Ligand binder design. Structure first.
Ligand SMILES: Cc1cc2cn([C@H]3C[C@H](O)[C@@H](CO)O3)c(=O)nc2[nH]1
Ligand SMILES: Cc1cc2cn([C@H]3C[C@H](O)[C@@H](CO)O3)c(=O)nc2[nH]1
Lengths: 212, 217
C-alpha cells in the first residue's frame, strides 16, 4: 500500500508561472472554505526552516542553495498532498509535479543542479511516486504570456523576463504538450485577462443575495 | 497506513564504525542465504548514480557533495528497509538510523552541511518516519575503539577510506555511543553489543546447520 491512501478528496491543482494571478484565483474559493480544503503555496515555511530563510538564500546563491531549497519545497508540497480532510474537495496552489517538471528542470538547465544532484532528486521522485498516494483529479492552468507575467511581478522579489520565459516553456511542455507523465486532465484559463470576477455566475445558496 | 507495512520480517541492523569488521560479520550469515534476506551496504549504487560516482566526490569534496551523497545514501537504505521477502529474517548492513544519527550529524558538526541543509534533511527524516514502515527488531552494535578501527582501515587500503583521519573515526565512535549506548536518540529497538576490537571471523560457529556435511553418515 502507499502512505495516506485514505486522503482521496477531489483534488484540483492550480498551476501557473510566477505572476499568473494564482493568489487572486485561489482567494476567490475562500467563500467555500467550509466545504473545500484550500492550501496556498507555503512560502512562509520556505522563509522559516527552524530559523533559516531558504527562499532568500536561493535567489541570492542558487548554485549552492538549489538542492536544499527544492528538497524542502518538495517536502512542503508532499505535506499539502497527503494532508487529510473530511471535505470532499481539496484545491492546492502548485504541486510536487510543478516542483519536478518545472522548477527542478529549469534549475538543471541553468546549471544550479549538477548531474549528481539532479539524478538523486529524480531517484527520490521515483521513490515518492511508488510510496506516497498523491490524489490529482484536475489541473487548472493559469496560462500567461511571459511579458504579461513580468509586468505583474514588478508589483516583491530581481527576476528576469528570461527566467519567466524558461518557466513558461516548461509549463507548455508539461500541460499543453504531454512531454511529462500526465497524472490527470488540464483545463486552461487565459490568465492574461483579469480573473477578479471568474465563477461569479455561480453563487452560494447561503449568500444574503437569496435572503427574503 | 504507512508504505510497505507488509514487509515485516524479523529485521536485524548491523551498526559500527568504518573498520568495525561489519563485512566479515555479515559474510558469516551467507550460509543462511536460503532463510535470511541478507542486504550488504549498497556501496556499488553510491559508486554509479545513472553514471556519476557519488562516494568519490564526497571524500574528494565533502562540502559540495555532502547534501546529495547523504540524500541518495538515505534513499538506498530506505530501499533495503522496504524490500519485501518471503524469508522470516532480514539482516541489513547499517540503516537509515546510522545515516541520520551518525553520518548526517557528523557532516553538520564538520560544517559540510550548513544549518539550512541539516534542517531540510531532519524535516525529511520526520516525514519518512511518518510515511514509511521501517521494521527494526534488533541492532547488533560492532563496538570498537577508534584506534583499532583506524589500524583495520590502514591494513585494507580500500581506496576511498585510506585517507580517513583517526579524528573522523573518533567523531563517528562518539555518535554511535550517543545512539546505541547512551540512548540520546529516539530508540526503536534493543541493542546487543559485540567487542569488535576482537576478531569475529569465527563468531557463532558453535552453531552448525543440520544440513552441514559434518553431520553426514
Ligand atoms: C512547487 C514550487 C513552488 C515554487 C515557487 N518558487 C518561487 C517562485 C516565486 O517567486 C515564489 C512564490 O511562488 O516562489 C520556486 O522557485 N520553485 C517552486 N516550486
Ligand atoms: C548509512 C550510511 C552508510 C554510510 C557509509 N559511508 C562510507 C563509510 C565507509 O567509508 C564506506 C562503506 O562503509 O561508506 C558514509 O560516508 N555515510 C554512510 N551512511
Amino acid at each position: 500500500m502507499k502512505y495516506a491512501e485514505g486522503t482521496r478528496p477531489f483534488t484540483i491543482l492550480i498551476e501557473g508561472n510566477i505572476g499568473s494571478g494564482k493568489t487572486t484565483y485561489l482567494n476567490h474559493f475562500e467563500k467555500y472554505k467550509d466545504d473545500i480544503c484550500l492550501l496556498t503555496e507555503p512560502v512562509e515555511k520556505w522563509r522559516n526552516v527552524n530559523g533559516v530563510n531558504l527562499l532568500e538564500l536561493m535567489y541570492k546563491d542558487p548554485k549552492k542553495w538549489a538542492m536544499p531549497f527544492v528538497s524542502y519545497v518538495t517536502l512542503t508540497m508532499l505535506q499539502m498532498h497527503t494532508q487529510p480532510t473530511n471535505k470532499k474537495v481539496k484545491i492546492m496552489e502548485r504541486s510536487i509535479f510543478s516542483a519536478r517538471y518545472c522548477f527542478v528542470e529549469n534549475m538543471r538547465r541553468n546549471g544550479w543542479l549538477e548531474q549528481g544532484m539532479y539524478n538523486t532528486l529524480e531517484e527520490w521522485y521515483k521513490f515518492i511516486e511508488e510510496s506516497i498516494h498523491i490524489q490529482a483529479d484536475l489541473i487548472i492552468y493559469l496560462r500567461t504570456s511571459p511579458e504579461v507575467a513580468y509586468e505583474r511581478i514588478r508589483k516583491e522579489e530581481n527576476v528576469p523576463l528570461e527566467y519567466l520565459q524558461q518557466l513558461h516553456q516548461l509549463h507548455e511542455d508539461w500541460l499543453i504538450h504531454q512531454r511529462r507523465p500526465q497524472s490527470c486532465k488540464v483545463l486552461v484559463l487565459d490568465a492574461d485577462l483579469n480573473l477578479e470576477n471568474i465563477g461569479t455566475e455561480y453563487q452560494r445558496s447561503e449568500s444574503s443575495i437569496f435572503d427574503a
